[PDB]
Design an enzyme around this catalytic site. Structure first.
Site, PDB file in Angstrom:
ATOM      1  N   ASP A   1       0.866  -1.214   0.000  1.00 34.37           N
ATOM      2  CA  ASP A   1       0.000   0.000   0.000  1.00 34.37           C
ATOM      3  C   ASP A   1       0.871   1.220   0.000  1.00 34.37           C
ATOM      4  OD1 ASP A   1      -1.914   1.970   1.872  1.00 34.37           O
ATOM      5  OD2 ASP A   1      -3.214   0.642   0.662  1.00 34.37           O
TER       6      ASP A   1
ATOM      7  N   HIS B   1      -6.880  -7.303   0.155  1.00 38.42           N
ATOM      8  CA  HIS B   1      -5.766  -6.353   0.104  1.00 38.42           C
ATOM      9  C   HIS B   1      -4.608  -6.622   1.003  1.00 38.42           C
ATOM     10  CE1 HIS B   1      -4.063  -2.375  -0.552  1.00 38.42           C
ATOM     11  NE2 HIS B   1      -4.295  -2.013   0.692  1.00 38.42           N
TER      12      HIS B   1
END
Ligand SMILES: [Cl-]
Ligand SMILES: [Cl-]
Ligand code: NI
Ligand code: NI
Lengths: 294, 304
Positions: free
Chosen positions: A112, A273
């Site tokens: 991320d 994710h």
């Protein structure tokens, strides 16, 4: 008493408070061998690596750092161009920290926002890196160029968190614990917090509870919309590509990464994710293999 | 004792709570002449028309309505498709309200969400309308088709308020008065609240202070991201155009012009459309009341 006595999720690792020209970086340090820096993203801290770092530490000196302004790292004062929270600035800062630890050259894995730091560090200073891994991202340029209805609705937070202060900050202040927990839940496979260790969730929640920390997160997204985007756009216009050997992992993209990198491998991982927490074994194995290759 | 004690922004106008199959519509009703319905948008109520309503009431029976779920109108129970807050359903409900008032045909002007009601009503039920005016909008489909990085940043609330409940509701609870005041100021030319009557601002603030009312607003934006878009997309694919004589007014620094030239967009959607800019930001009837009232009076009135 200036820091909370939160859970220790890295048994055997030491703690380092590392000096830089922009402030101290906090990191956990474990293992032995070639240096490997691991960088988290939003809305997490360095603890997100707690399930993979022990495996990696068999073969590498694993340095698990809080990004500038996140977790327990110091929060440099920002400016109207969000400079210290740009990926370019964060990369320079983390280079300073690694040099403190004895490492002019290192391997790097990011997730991320930390993956954004990582690919920007590879563009700006490729000589610093032996190998790079990025988890569950495309370049910032690519997210913005593809912006349309469907993406605006999925990644709404890129545009909400980038609104001028104090708008997002005033909204996040009502019920920050709800926002952070629902964000972590919503981009897992299960759609709940079952994938996370509750002690890790507490680290995340304690960070997010502090208005100064939330302001840093908004500055990060404001960089993300503006300077970081312009930095990436400059590289696209010159067809600049990362020459460092690279691995792209994503939650079930390599075609996007070929345009940006001349030596890239990839694989899907069975995960939403949060790869290192949702799929620690599969993630650890992919990284161990990649980084042990010479 | 629960109402606040507030001055009348429409002196001389009646107050009606009009029954429909979906809930009551609140309206102020004034003037003399053939009927003209005025529909506000977000984050406002019917009071936004208070500086143009007197001029229009010289020649028209002016009906100044709170949209379904806004202001003092009742809040219909929503569903997974946000049906009652779709512009199609709002149009149907306001048609019922006009029929209760004795008007099966009428003229219509709308601003912001109320303009979206109004063009949808003209698409779905053109036989209801004599003339239509839309203020500071393009069709919902057109905003979404233009939703690139720059527009995603400018009209972020289209995506934010459309997130599944309770995300935006719980955030808006954080400081609702700040949020509404910042929204109102941000879309004005001055970038402050100087264009608005402070008494109207208080109406908007009081509405926005109510969590049930903020939930309606979010349902409206959810409809705007989903069913309302799909309803538009059907018309665009078919080549369906509004046949009613129409007026598009927009702010020289408003939202519609931000990423389009509005008259040519509206000509894709309407076969008999005229349009012009007004020196204003988004809030035409408050920022530019004299100019806006004149435009409206000239368009709806047969006399010069
Ligand atoms: Cl270099
Ligand atoms: Cl009809
Ligand atoms: Ni202490
Ligand atoms: Ni009362």
């Amino acid at each position: 008493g200036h820091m909370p006595d939160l859970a220790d999720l890295f048994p055997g690792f030491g703690s380092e408070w590392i000096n830089t020209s922009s402030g101290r970086i906090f990191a956990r340090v474990g293992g032995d061998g070639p240096p490997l820096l691991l960088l988290h993203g939003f809305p997490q801290t360095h603890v997100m690596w707690h399930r993979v770092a022990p495996k990696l530490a068999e073969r590498f000196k694993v340095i698990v750092a809080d990004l500038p302004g996140y977790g327990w790292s110091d929060m440099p004062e920002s400016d109207e161009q969000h400079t210290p929270y740009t990926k370019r600035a964060m990369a320079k800062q983390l280079i300073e920290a690694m040099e403190q630890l004895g490492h002019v050259h290192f391997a790097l894995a990011g997730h991320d926002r930390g993956a954004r730091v990582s690919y920007r560090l590879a563009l700006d200073s490729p000589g610093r890196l032996s190998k790079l891994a990025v988890l569950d991202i495309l370049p910032t340029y690519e997210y913005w160029q593809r912006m349309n209805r469907a993406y605006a609705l999925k990644i709404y937070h890129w545009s909400f968190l980038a609104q001028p202060a104090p708008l997002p900050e005033n909204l996040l202040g009502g019920d920050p614990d709800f926002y952070v927990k629902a964000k972590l839940a919503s981009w897992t496979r299960a759609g709940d917090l079952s994938a996370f260790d509750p002690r890790a969730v507490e680290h995340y929640r304690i960070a997010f509870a502090d208005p100064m920390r939330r302001h840093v997160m908004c500055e990060d997204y404001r960089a993300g919309a503006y300077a970081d985007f312009e930095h990436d756009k400059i590289d696209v216009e010159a067809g600049n590509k990362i020459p460092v050997p690279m691995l792209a992992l994503w939650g079930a993209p390599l075609d996007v990464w070929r345009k940006w990198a001349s030596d890239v491998q990839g694989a899907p991982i069975e995960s939403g994710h949060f790869l290192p927490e949702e799929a620690p074994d599969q993630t650890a194995e992919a990284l161990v293999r990649f980084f042990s290759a010479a």
